[PDB]
Design a protein around this ligand. Structure first.
Ligand code: CU
Length: 98
C-alpha cells in the first residue's frame, strides 16, 4: 500500500507525495487530509492504452478529513491524476505502475 495524502499538513494544495511508483495490483490509499474539498481525476490523456480513466476516478468531492478512496492499477505505465478545484494551484500527481 502507498498512502497519498490529499492536501499537505502545512496547507499546500498538493498530493503528498505527488510522484510514486507502485506494483500492478498494489493498493494506493488516497487519504483526505487538509484543504478539502478535493476529488481524484485520472487524466484521460495521460493513462496507458486500454485504460478507462473515468472508471478509476473519484469525481465527487471528498469533504471530511479521513475519507479514504483505494485504487489498485493493473496496466503498467504512467498515470496522470489531478484535483479539479485545485488543478491551477499545482495539485496534480504522477503514478508509475510497474
Ligand atoms: Cu484538491
Amino acid at each position: 500500500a502507498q498512502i497519498v495524502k490529499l492536501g499537505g499538513d502545512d496547507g499546500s494544495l498538493a498530493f503528498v507525495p505527488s510522484k510514486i511508483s507502485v506494483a500492478a495490483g498494489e493498493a494506493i490509499e488516497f487519504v483526505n487530509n487538509a484543504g478539502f474539498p478535493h476529488n481524484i481525476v485520472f487524466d484521460e490523456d495521460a493513462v496507458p492504452a486500454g485504460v478507462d480513466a473515468d472508471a478509476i476516478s473519484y469525481d465527487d468531492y471528498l469533504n471530511s478529513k479521513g475519507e479514504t478512496v483505494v485504487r489498485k492499477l493493473s496496466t503498467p505505465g504512467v498515470y496522470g491524476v489531478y484535483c479539479e478545484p485545485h488543478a491551477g494551484a499545482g495539485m496534480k500527481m504522477t503514478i508509475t505502475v510497474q
